Ligand binder design. Structure first.
Ligand code: NA
Ligand code: NA
Ligand code: NA
Length: 441
């Protein structure tokens, strides 16, 4: 077999992107409910009030996954369902994740739970959010409650999804909630996110849950200089430090990357760095989840102003270059520089294309079939070169709410007709079903 029977073929979603039921069974608003109601923040003022209605349709969706042969399901847990007010636990919110995970297990699907996938409760943001160091304790209490109530259901835990997005994209670029534009704030948020991750790991190890694993998920790219010039080499180094090393180094080396500490320090405070915090941040993990989509080609441009070059190759509807070799290059880089023999999962990879249901009732998404084929071939090549890849989760199970793009970008292997909430298997889902069945590519 190209992929062993123990290899996990998975799919992934996130709570606010698919669940809907935004005001039901005690759920209160997250920063994204609020953000999507602010004019100009989200495409056509789309929001996740209803999304895919997965909260109500979860049994049908699990049956769909079973019929595809899905072996693992990565989802996130909505903090505002579990603690809809500070210190106020909501058993009805917990009950959803129990019946969801009970359904998954009874259909032979391994649950992978993301504790935080960007839907911070509005009550927490009103108290300062990720800028308030006290969030470390709020997050730890939330995580401990999940570990204690769901530890018999879920054995694979992910603390945070893509902390680069929750920090720089949300507080510096301002495209994501809460939408600040302040480099110093983004840097502090990145530190408090990592410290909160560390607190959850410390709680996790103290519980000593049998056969349970914990990790984190990072979106990673590969940065190419546009030319062999020294200017473009420095630009690539900064861009690589900004996207990848700012998170990889504290997690796996116990130290922020010094070139970036000095670079950022020309523009903002970096005084949050201290030894005690970096010891918590760098606690040993059981696995690393890698979210990979594309590379960047950069030339010198100013503060983080590298011009992004278009190398003229095929792209997705996001404008992201289709460059499968960087999946292998990034996995090898981790093996050789950061994670060594530690298990790796691809916790997201996928693509947005202009999907259309044709008169035959089918979605002939050939470009997504070819995209996934090329990237799974690179995963296979990593394995046959000795990489410790344990699974691969396609983003996404279904079309969903794509953050600032609303519903205009479709990432699913399953098409959702939002008017009816009908699920339509795309050709990529049928291709994936065959890959799982044959384990051959
Ligand atoms: Na939602
Ligand atoms: Na809205
Ligand atoms: Na580790």
């Amino acid at each position: 077999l190209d992929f062993s029977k123990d290899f996990l073929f998975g799919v992934a979603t996130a709570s606010y992107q698919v669940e809907g039921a935004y005001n039901e069974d005690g759920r209160t608003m997250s920063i994204w409910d609020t953000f999507s109601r602010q004019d100009g923040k989200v495409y056509k003022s789309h929001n996740g009030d209803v999304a895919c209605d997965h909260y109500h349709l979860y049994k049908d969706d699990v049956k769909m996954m079973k019929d595809l042969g899905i072996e693992a399901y990565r989802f996130s847990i909505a903090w505002p369902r579990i603690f809809p007010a500070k210190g106020q636990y909501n058993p009805k919110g917990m009950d959803f994740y129990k019946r969801l995970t009970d359904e998954l297990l009874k259909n032979d699907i391994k649950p992978f739970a993301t504790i935080y996938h960007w839907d911070l409760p509005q009550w927490a943001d009103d108290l300062g959010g990720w800028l308030n160091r006290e969030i470390v304790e709020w997050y730890g209490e939330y995580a401990e409650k999940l570990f204690s109530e769901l530890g018999g259901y879920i054995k694979n835990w992910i603390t945070l999804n893509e902390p680069w997005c929750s920090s720089f994209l949300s507080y510096f670029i301002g495209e994501h909630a809460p939408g600040h534009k302040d480099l110093g704030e983004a840097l502090l948020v990145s530190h408090n996110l990592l410290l909160s991750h560390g607190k959850a790991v410390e709680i996790f190890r103290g519980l000593n849950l049998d056969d349970s694993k914990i990790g984190i998920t990072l979106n990673l790219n590969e940065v190419f200089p546009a030319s062999d010039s020294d200017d473009d080499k420095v630009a690539a180094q900064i861009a690589d430090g900004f996207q990848n090393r700012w998170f990889l180094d504290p997690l796996f080396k116990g130290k922020y990357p010094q070139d970036m500490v000095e670079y950022f320090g020309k523009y903002a405070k970096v005084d949050f760095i201290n030894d005690e915090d970096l010891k918590l941040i760098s606690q040993k993990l059981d696995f690393l989840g890698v979210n990979y989509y594309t590379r960047a080609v950069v030339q010198k441009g100013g503060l983080l102003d590298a011009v992004q070059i278009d190398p003229g190759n095929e792209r997705t509807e996001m404008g992201w270059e289709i460059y499968p070799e960087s999946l292998y290059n990034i996995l090898m880089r981790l093996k050789r520089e950061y994670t060594y023999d530690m298990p790796l999962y691809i916790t997201e990879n996928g693509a947005a294309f202009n999907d259309v249901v044709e008169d035959d009732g089918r979605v002939h998404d050939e470009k997504r079939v070819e995209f996934l084929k090329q990237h799974f071939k690179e995963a296979k090549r990593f394995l046959n070169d000795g990489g410790n890849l344990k699974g691969y989760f396609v983003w996404s199970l279904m079309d969903n709410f794509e953050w600032a793009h609303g519903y205009s970008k479709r990432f699913g292997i399953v098409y959702v007709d939002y008017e009816t909430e009908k699920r339509i298997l795309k050709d990529s889902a049928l291709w994936y079903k065959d890959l799982i069945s044959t384990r051959t590519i």
